[PDB]
Design a protein around this ligand. Structure first.
Ligand SMILES: Nc1ncnc2c1ncn2[C@@H]1O[C@H](COP(=O)(O)OP(=O)(O)O)[C@@H](O)[C@H]1O
Ligand code: BEF
Lengths: 473, 10, 65, 445
C-alpha cells in the first residue's frame, strides 16, 4: 500500500479495503480472492480450476461457509497444523496460493503460513508393551525435551497418564508430535486377517478420506468428517481391514454399539467368533489371539465404581496393546472425563469419525493433541446432488402462541417458561396436521423432543410409541 | 412463499 | 356526544398483552380497552410504547454480533 | 415511461404556449420523434402537401388488425395540438399546424432555420479524455450526494435546492441531514435516460417568472447537438440556464464556447455487466462492481464487510434492511434491485431448476426466480416486523343518548372514509384526526 489514493466510499470499509493492491491480468480465470488481514479466502465455484482448489483449500483452510456459488474458507493455525502433516511444506502451499489467486498474496498471509508450516516431523511417540517412549530420531532434541519445564536415536520413557500433557506441551514448543504407524513392519502384535468382501463398493469420497490417511503408507492418526449417513462406518471398517491388527471401537450408545457389530459383520469378512460387544448387557471378551472390541465411553471412561463383571473386562482391555481405535462421534471425546480413555487405552493409531465437529465450549481444539489433526472433510450438497445422501426441504413453522397461554409466558420464570411454550395447543395442531398429511403420503416420520413430559403427552394423545432415556435397551 | 396469508390455528 | 383525543392501537394478542404489561408498570399507557385487537393509548406514550416494545421483542431475536 | 413522461409534460402545457414552442425547428424535430410510429407516418404525409385531408382517408390506410393503434395515435397527436380538426361542408376535415408544418419543412429541406441547431466553432476537444470524465464525475457527484455517502466536493446550491424541493432526498433542519426516500430509490433504479429526465422535468416546474418555452428550446435543441464538437454562443434566459445545466454534467465549459457531453446525446433517444451481484442462502452479497456509485447504493441496505478492485463482498442483515426501510425504501424495490442486477450464474442455475420442475411435471409453469426465495421471504417478514404496531391519531366518540344517533354519526364517518373502528354494543367508535372536524360539524347539524 504505497501511493494509493483512497476512494470517497472507502470510509464504509473500516481498514478492510484491499484495493491498495492491483489485479493480475489473468483475473478472469483465477478463482481465489485472499483477504490480506483476516485470512479469509473467497472461492469461485463456477470458474475453471474450481475443483482443483476445492480440495486444496479444504486441507490448508477450515471452511466457514460453502453456499451454492461462492465458497468462503479461512486460514488459521489449526488448519495449517492439519495440512502440515500429509507431506506438505511451506513452498507448495505458497506456490499454489499464488497460482490460484486473482490478487497477489500479501506478505502478512505469507508470514502466517511460514510460521506454522515448519514445525512438523521431528518427534515421534511410540508404544511398546504398554510402555510409552518419546523416541526422537536425532540427539539434539534431548537438550530440549529433557530440559523442558513441564516434561518430567535416543528414546526415554514417560508416564502413561502424562501423555496428554507432553502432547500439548509439544504444541507450545517448536515441535508437535505425529502418531504414525508402520503396521507393515509390526510383527509383535498378532495380526487379524479380515478383508472387505467382494460385494463391497467403496464410494469415491470414502477412498479419498482413506487416501489422506494412508497416503505415505503408514497409518496417520486423525479425524475424518463426513455428512450424516455418508458411510463413516465403512470408512472405519476399511481402515481396520487394511491395518489388519486388533482394533477397539468406542461408540456413545448401546443401540449404536449394536449397530456397529452388525455393520462390521455385514460389510467385511470379520468372523463372529472374534467379535465381542462390551455393553451393559453382555461383557464376555474374545479369547482368540487377535479380535475386536466394540464398546462405549460410559463403559470405558468410568473411574470410581466398576462392577466385578466389568472389572475383568477393563483389565483385559488395558493389558493388551491395541493396534487401532475408532472413536465414533468424536465431538464428545474432549469432554472432562471421556478424554481419559484416549490416554489409558494403548494404541498406535487413532481415528475419529463424526458428521459434526462442533461444541459450545472451547474444547474442540483439544482434539489436535488427543487423536491428531483433521485429515479430510466432505461437502454436504456435493454428496446430495450425487445421490449419496437425501435432499431435504428444511422448514421452520411459526405457530403463534394463543392469547391465553402467552399471558402466562410474561410472568413466569425462565425455567418454567420453557414447558409453557413447548405445550401451546397450536403446536399440537400443527404436529397433528403434518403427521396426518405425511402419513397419507406413505412417509415414515420421526418426532424429536428433548423434553420428556411433552414427548409422553404427545405420544399418549396420538397413540404412538415413544422412546426416552429410561427405556430398556 | 406464504408470508401474507393468515396464521395457522384452530 | 363526547369526543376523547387519543391514539387507536391496532395489534394482535401478543402485542396486546405486551402493551398491558407496559401499562401495568406505567399506568398512563392504556386509556381504555376497546376490543381484543384495539386499544386506546395516551398520545404522549405512543412514541414510547412503540419504542419500548421493540426493545422487549429484541430478546426473542438472535442478532449475531 | 421515458416517452410517456416527456409526452405527459408536453400535454399539460396550454395550447397558447404550444404554438410558440414550434417556432424553432430544432424542437419540432425532437417532438416529432416521441410520437407513436403511426403518428409519425401520418405527420410525414401531411407535411409536404398544402391541403386538407379528411379523417376518413387516414382511417382507410390502417388495416383491420391495427385499428386499435389508430386511436392512440390520433389521441396523442391531438393532445399536443399538432393536428387541428376543422369541420366544414359537413365533413370533419383534418389539417396540420402551420407553424409545426413550416418548421419541419425547414428542418428536412435545409431551409432558413435561425440557428435552431446552433453553430460550430471548429475547435474540437477530446471526447474520451475530458467530456466523458467531466460529466461522469459531475453526474457522479450528484448521485453520490444523493445516496448519502460522504463526499469531499458537495454540489452547488442550484442542484441542491432542486434536490430538496423535489420529493427526492427529503431533508429536515432539526435532523440536520438528508436521506433518500421511496421515490429516491426508484430514481436510482431508473436508467440514465430517465434518471436525467426526472431532474430536468423537476427543473422545468421549479423555475418561476425565464420562459417555459426557452427552457425547452434548449433541452430539445441540446439533443440535436453532437458530442465532441464546439458550438459558439442564443437567448438571454439560455445563458444562465446554460450555466445551471453545467451543474448536472450535461454541458462542459472551459471557462465563449460550450460543449455538450455524452449525457447531452443520451437525452434524445435510446442509447459481464458491472453491478451484477451474487446473493447466497447465507444472506451474503458479492457484487462484481468497481464503481463508487454502485457501492454507495448497495450500502443503503447492505452491511459492507470488505472490498477488492474487482468485486465487493458484504452481508445482508436485519440492521441494514431496517435502516433502508426507515428511509422509505420498500422491500419490493430492494428485490427488484437484486433481481435486475443478478449474476449470470444465478440465472443459469434458476433456469436449470425450472427445467427440472417442468421435466417432472410440464403442466404448471413456475415463475423463474433468479435468487433464493428465503432471502425475499425474510426481507418481507422484516417489513412486517416494522408494520407490527399500528397507531392512528384521532378521537373516541362515546356516551350517546340514542342508538339512532350513534349509528347516524358512525355511518356518516364510514361514508366519508374517516371511520377506523366501531362497536355497536358499547355505542363507541374511533375516527381519524383528519375527519374529526367534519364529524363534529355534522354532529351539530
Ligand atoms: N458404500 C456403501 N454401500 C452401501 N451402503 C452404504 C455405503 N456407505 C454407506 N452406506 C449406508 O449408509 C447408511 C449410513 O451409514 P452409517 O455408517 O451409519 O453413516 P454415518 O455413521 O456417517 O451416519 C447405512 O444404511 C449404510 O449401509
Ligand atoms: F448418523 Be451418522 F452416525 F453421522
Amino acid at each position: 500500500p504505497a501511493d494509493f489514493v483512497p476512494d470517497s466510499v472507502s470510509g464504509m470499509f473500516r481498514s478492510h479495503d484491499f484495493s491498495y493492491l492491483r489485479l493480475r491480468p489473468d483475473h478472469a480465470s483465477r478463482p481465489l480472492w485472499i483477504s490480506p488481514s483476516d485470512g479469509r479466502i473467497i472461492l469461485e465455484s463456477f470458474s475453471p480450476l474450481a475443483e482443483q482448489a476445492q480440495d486444496f483449500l479444504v486441507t490448508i483452510a477450515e471452511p466457514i461457509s460453502r453456499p451454492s456459488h461462492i465458497h468462503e474458507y479461512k486460514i488459521t493455525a489449526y488448519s495449517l497444523y492439519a495440512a502440515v502433516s500429509v507431506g506438505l511444506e511451506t513452498d507448495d502451499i505458497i506456490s499454489v496460493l499464488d497460482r490460484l489467486s486473482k490478487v497477489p498474496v500479501a506478505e502478512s498471509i505469507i508470514n502466517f503460513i511460514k510460521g506454522a508450516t515448519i514445525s512438523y516431523g521431528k518427534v515421534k511417540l511410540v508404544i511398546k508393551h504398554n510402555r510409552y517412549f518419546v523416541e526422537t530420531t536425532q540427539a539434539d532434541i534431548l537438550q530440549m525435551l529433557l530440559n523442558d519445564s513441564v516434561i518430567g536415536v535416543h528414546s526415554f520413557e514417560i508416564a502413561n497418564e502424562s501423555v496428554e500433557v507432553v502432547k500439548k506441551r509439544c504444541q507450545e514448543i517448536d515441535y508437535p508430535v505425529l502418531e504414525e504407524y508402520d503396521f507393515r513392519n509390526d510383527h509383535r502384535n498378532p495380526d487379524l486377517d479380515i478383508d472387505l468382501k467382494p460385494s463391497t463398493q467403496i464410494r469415491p469420497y470414502q477412498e479419498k478420506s482413506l487416501s489422506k490417511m494412508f497416503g505415505n503408507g503408514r497409518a496417520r492418526s486423525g479425524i475424518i468428517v463426513l455428512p450424516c449417513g455418508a458411510g463413516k462406518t465403512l470408512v472405519g471398517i476399511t481402515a481396520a481391514c487394511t491395518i489388519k491388527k486388533s482394533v477397539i471401537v468406542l461408540c456413545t450408545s448401546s443401540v449404536s454399539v449394536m449397530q456397529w457389530r452388525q455393520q462390521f459383520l455385514q460389510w467385511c469378512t470379520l468372523q463372529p467368533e472374534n467379535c465381542a460387544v462390551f455393553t451393559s448387557d453382555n461383557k464376555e471378551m474374545f479369547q482368540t489371539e487377535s479380535g475386536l472390541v466394540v464398546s462405549t465411553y460410559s463403559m470405558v471412561a468410568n473411574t470410581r465404581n466398576r462392577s466385578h463383571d466389568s472389572q475383568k473386562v477393563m483389565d483385559f482391555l488395558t493389558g493388551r496393546e491395541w493396534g487401532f481405535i475408532i472413536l465414533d462421534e468424536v465431538h464428545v471425546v474432549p469432554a472432562a472425563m471421556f478424554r481419559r480413555v484416549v490416554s489409558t487405552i494403548a494404541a498406535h493409531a487413532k481415528l475419529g469419525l463424526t458428521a459434526t465437529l462442533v461444541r459450545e465450549d472451547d474444547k474442540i481444539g483439544d482434539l489436535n493433541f488427543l487423536i491428531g489433526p483433521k485429515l479430510y472433510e466432505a461437502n454436504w450438497m456435493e454428496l446430495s446432488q450425487k445421490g449419496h445422501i437425501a435432499n431435504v426441504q428444511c422448514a421452520e413453522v411459526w405457530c403463534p402462541m394463543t392469547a391465553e397461554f402467552y399471558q402466562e409466558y410474561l410472568r413466569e420464570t425462565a425455567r418454567k417458561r420453557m414447558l409453557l411454550y413447548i405445550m401451546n395447543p397450536t403446536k399440537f395442531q400443527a404436529c397433528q396436521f403434518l403427521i396426518q398429511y405425511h402419513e397419507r403420503r406413505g412417509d415414515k416420520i420421526i418426532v424429536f423432543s428433548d423434553n420428556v413430559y411433552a414427548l409422553q403427552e404427545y405420544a399418549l394423545k396420538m397413540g404412538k410409541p415413544f422412546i426416552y432415556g429410561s427405556t430398556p435397551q | 412463499s406464504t408470508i401474507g396469508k393468515t396464521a395457522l390455528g384452530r | 356526544a363526547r369526543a376523547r383525543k387519543g391514539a387507536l392501537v391496532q395489534c394482535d394478542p401478543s402485542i396486546k398483552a405486551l402493551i398491558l404489561q407496559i401499562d401495568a408498570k406505567m399506568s398512563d399507557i392504556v386509556l381504555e380497552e376497546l376490543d381484543d385487537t384495539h386499544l386506546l393509548v395516551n398520545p404522549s406514550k405512543v412514541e414510547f410504547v412503540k419504542h419500548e416494545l421493540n426493545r422487549l421483542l429484541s430478546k426473542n431475536i438472535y442478532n449475531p454480533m | 415511461s421515458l416517452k410517456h413522461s416527456v409526452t405527459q409534460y408536453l400535454e399539460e402545457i396550454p395550447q397558447q404556449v404550444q404554438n410558440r414552442l414550434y417556432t424553432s425547428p430544432a424542437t419540432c424535430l425532437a417532438i416529432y420523434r416521441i410520437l407513436p410510429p403511426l403518428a409519425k407516418f401520418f405527420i410525414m404525409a401531411m407535411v409536404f402537401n398544402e391541403n386538407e385531408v379528411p379523417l376518413l382517408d387516414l382511417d382507410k390506410w390502417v388495416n383491420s388488425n391495427g385499428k386499435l393503434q389508430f386511436q392512440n395515435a390520433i389521441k396523442s397527436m391531438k393532445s399536443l395540438h399538432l393536428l387541428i380538426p376543422n369541420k366544414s361542408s359537413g365533413t370533419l376535415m383534418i389539417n396540420l399546424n402551420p407553424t409545426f408544418k413550416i418548421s419541419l419543412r425547414n428542418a428536412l429541406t435545409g431551409g432558413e432555420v435561425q440557428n435552431s441547431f446552433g453553430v460550430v466553432v471548429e475547435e474540437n476537444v477530446v471526447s474520451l479524455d475530458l467530456l466523458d470524465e467531466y460529466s461522469a464525475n459531475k453526474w457522479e457527484t450528484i448521485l453520490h450526494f444523493m445516496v448519502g455517502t460522504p463526499l469531499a466536493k458537495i454540489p452547488s446550491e442550484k442542484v441542491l435546492n432542486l434536490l430538496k424541493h423535489s420529493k427526492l432526498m427529503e431533508e429536515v433542519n432539526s435532523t440536520g441531514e438528508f436521506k433518500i426516500t421511496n421515490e429516491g430509490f426508484q430514481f436510482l433504479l431508473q436508467e440514465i435516460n430517465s434518471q436525467l429526465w426526472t431532474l430536468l422535468l423537476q427543473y422545468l416546474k421549479m423555475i418561476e417568472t425565464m420562459d417555459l418555452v426557452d427552457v425547452l428550446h434548449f433541452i430539445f435543441m441540446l439533443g440535436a447537438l453532437e458530442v465532441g464538437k464546439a458550438y459558439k454562443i442564443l437567448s438571454e434566459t439560455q445563458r444562465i440556464m446554460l450555466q445551471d445545466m453545467r451543474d448536472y454534467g450535461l454541458v462542459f465549459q472551459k471557462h465563449s464556447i460550450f460543449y455538450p457531453t455524452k449525457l447531452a446525446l443520451m437525452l434524445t433517444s435510446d442509447t459481464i455487466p458491472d453491478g451484477s451481484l451474487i446473493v447466497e442462502t447465507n444472506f451474503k452479497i458479492y457484487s462484481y462492481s468497481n464503481s463508487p456509485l454502485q457501492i454507495a447504493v448497495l450500502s443503503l441496505f447492505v452491511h459492507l464487510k470488505a472490498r477488492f478492485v474487482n468485486m465487493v463482498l458484504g452481508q445482508i442483515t436485519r440492521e441494514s434492511i431496517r435502516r433502508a426501510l426507515t428511509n422509505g425504501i420498500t422491500a419490493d424495490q430492494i428485490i427488484a434491485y437484486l433481481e435486475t442486477h443478478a449474476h449470470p450464474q444465478m440465472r443459469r442455475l434458476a433456469e436449470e431448476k425450472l427445467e427440472k420442475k417442468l421435466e417432472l411435471d410440464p403442466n404448471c409453469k413456475e415463475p423463474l426466480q433468479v435468487l433464493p426465495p428465503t432471502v425475499v421471504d425474510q426481507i418481507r417478514l422484516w417489513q412486517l416486523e416494522l408494520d407490527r404496531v399500528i397507531t392512528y391519531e384521532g378521537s373516541l366518540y362515546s356516551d350517546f343518548e340514542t342508538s339512532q344517533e350513534y349509528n347516524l354519526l358512525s355511518k356518516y364517518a364510514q361514508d366519508i372514509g374517516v371511520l377506523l373502528w366501531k362497536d355497536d354494543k358499547k355505542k363507541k367508535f374511533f375516527i381519524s384526526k383528519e375527519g374529526n372536524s367534519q364529524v363534529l360539524d355534522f354532529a351539530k347539524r
